[PDB]
Each structure stands twice: as C-alpha cells, then as structure tokens.
N, CA, C and O atoms as a GROMACS GRO file, in nm:
protein
   52
    1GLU      N    1   0.086  -0.119   0.000
    1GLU     CA    2   0.000   0.000   0.000
    1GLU      C    3   0.091   0.125   0.000
    1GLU      O    4   0.164   0.150   0.096
    2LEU      N    5   0.084   0.204  -0.111
    2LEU     CA    6   0.169   0.326  -0.135
    2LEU      C    7   0.323   0.300  -0.120
    2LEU      O    8   0.376   0.312  -0.009
    3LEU      N    9   0.394   0.264  -0.230
    3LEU     CA   10   0.534   0.206  -0.229
    3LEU      C   11   0.584   0.128  -0.102
    3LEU      O   12   0.686   0.164  -0.044
    4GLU      N   13   0.509   0.021  -0.062
    4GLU     CA   14   0.544  -0.075   0.042
    4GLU      C   15   0.456  -0.042   0.172
    4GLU      O   16   0.379  -0.130   0.210
    5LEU      N   17   0.464   0.077   0.240
    5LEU     CA   18   0.538   0.090   0.369
    5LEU      C   19   0.675   0.017   0.383
    5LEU      O   20   0.680  -0.096   0.432
    6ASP      N   21   0.787   0.081   0.339
    6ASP     CA   22   0.930   0.028   0.339
    6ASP      C   23   0.968  -0.084   0.441
    6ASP      O   24   1.006  -0.068   0.557
    7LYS      N   25   0.949  -0.198   0.375
    7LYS     CA   26   1.040  -0.327   0.398
    7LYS      C   27   0.978  -0.403   0.519
    7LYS      O   28   1.040  -0.415   0.624
    8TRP      N   29   0.854  -0.455   0.501
    8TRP     CA   30   0.765  -0.501   0.613
    8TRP      C   31   0.738  -0.390   0.719
    8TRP      O   32   0.796  -0.392   0.828
    9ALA      N   33   0.648  -0.294   0.686
    9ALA     CA   34   0.609  -0.175   0.770
    9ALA      C   35   0.720  -0.116   0.863
    9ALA      O   36   0.720  -0.143   0.984
   10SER      N   37   0.814  -0.036   0.808
   10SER     CA   38   0.948  -0.009   0.867
   10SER      C   39   1.023  -0.141   0.904
   10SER      O   40   1.061  -0.215   0.814
   11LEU      N   41   1.045  -0.172   1.034
   11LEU     CA   42   1.079  -0.307   1.080
   11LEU      C   43   1.048  -0.312   1.233
   11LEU      O   44   1.064  -0.211   1.303
   12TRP      N   45   1.004  -0.430   1.284
   12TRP     CA   46   1.006  -0.460   1.431
   12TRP      C   47   1.150  -0.463   1.489
   12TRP      O   48   1.242  -0.517   1.427
   13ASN      N   49   1.167  -0.404   1.608
   13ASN     CA   50   1.299  -0.395   1.675
   13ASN      C   51   1.279  -0.397   1.829
   13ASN      O   52   1.376  -0.390   1.904
   0.00000   0.00000   0.00000
C-alpha cells in the first residue's frame, strides 16, 4: 500500500 510501507512496515525492533 503506497510504495510498500518500506520493507515489512518499517521493521520490528
């Protein structure tokens, strides 16, 4: 949805 949300929705950390 709209160029990704970059790389699995930001990233879990």
